C-alpha cells in the first residue's frame, strides 16, 4: 500500500513544530549564502526532527495495527 503511517503522521504534526523548522530554514539560507568552506548546521535539523519524532511517537503506535 502506498500509504505510510509514519510519514503521514510526520506531515500531520509538521505545523506543531514551526519554530525549529523556521530556524532550520533560516540556517539553510545562511549556508547557501556563504557557500565558502565546509559549514553546516545539523543542529537545527536535529532539533526539528527530534521534536517532530517526540510528537509522532504515541499516535504512530495507536494508529498502527
Amino acid at each position: 500500500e502506498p500509504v505510510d503511517q509514519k510519514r503521514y503522521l510526520e506531515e500531520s504534526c509538521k505545523p506543531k513544530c514551526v519554530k525549529p523548522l523556521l530556524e532550520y530554514q533560516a540556517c539553510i539560507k545562511r549556508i547557501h549564502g556563504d557557500d565558502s568552506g565546509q559549514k553546516h548546521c545539523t543542529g537545527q535539523y536535529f532539533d526539528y526532527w527530534f521534536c517532530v519524532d517526540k510528537c509522532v511517537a504515541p499516535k504512530l503506535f495507536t494508529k498502527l495495527k
Binding site: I31, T42, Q44, Y45, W49
Partner: peptide, 24 residues
C-alpha cells in the same frame, strides 16, 4: 525502530561519502 524507519535526507552542507547512506 527509528534506525530502520528514519532514512531521511541529510541537512544542508553535509555530504556523505559515496557508497554510504545517511541516517540521522
Amino acid at each position: 525502530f527509528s534506525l530502520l524507519t528514519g532514512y531521511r535526507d541529510p541537512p544542508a552542507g553535509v555530504s556523505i561519502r559515496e557508497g554510504l547512506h545517511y541516517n540521522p
